Amino acid sequence: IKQGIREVILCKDQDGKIGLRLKSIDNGIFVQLVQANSPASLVGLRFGDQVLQINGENCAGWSSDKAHKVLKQAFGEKITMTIRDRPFERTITMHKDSTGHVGFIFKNGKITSIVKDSSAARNGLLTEHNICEINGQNVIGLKDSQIADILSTSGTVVTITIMPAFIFEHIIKRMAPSIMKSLMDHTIPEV
């Protein structure tokens, strides 16, 4: 979680899509959803990103409807956005035992309990926090069994990105768990 405000310049695809959904939160605008193989993925927008500006206009106080509206009525050649990097998240670095564990329990993306004398504890992993990314990869919407496989298949060093569940649950409301799994960008970054 960089503590930085960054510029990104966008370019609509042939369908005139960027691949993005924005949710009004606390009078900000925040990335609800990032489509795979989308202009928005390529410039690196991520779930939980804050959109400070769209085309040099502040987003403070905009409805989700107005942000999506703004986005359609944009010219399409260049859409310059100002991004604050994933304000509502935090990233933990953990190591595995020889039993291959970081040492916690989660259910529906959300961590429910922490297992004592584990790296999860040594590093102060919290509960009631939804798993947002793992080692770069947005896992929002995957099944628990699939998340487990990614942690299984991770090296010894695992890097998790969490969000308070009350915030998490406010971002994802009005987005179907179908689309969460289908079209949300669950991919490693292109270089």
Ligand X SMILES: CN(C)C(=O)Cn1ncc2ccccc21
DSSP, res 118 = S
> Encoding tokens for residue 109?
């993306």
Tell me how many degrees the CA angle 40-144-119 measures, rounded to the nearest 5. 95
Contact string (CB under 6 A) for ligand X, positions 66-105, x = contact:
--xx--x---------------------------------
> Interface with ligand X by CB under 6 A: which range of 9-17, 30-38, 65-73, 152-160?
65-73
Residue ranges of the binding site: 108, 143-144
Q: How far is the CB of 21 from ligand X (least distance, A)?
A: 11
Which burial class, exposed, middle or buried, applies to 43 when counting CB atoms under 10 A from its CB (0-12, 13-18, 19+)? Answer: middle
Number of residues written out for the chain = 191
> Encoding tokens for residue 43?
């410039």
Q: Which is nearer to ligand X, 23 or 129 (CB)?
A: 23
Q: Which is nearer to ligand X, 21 or 186 (CB)?
A: 21
Q: Binding residues for ligand X, per CB under 6 A? A: 65, 68-69, 72
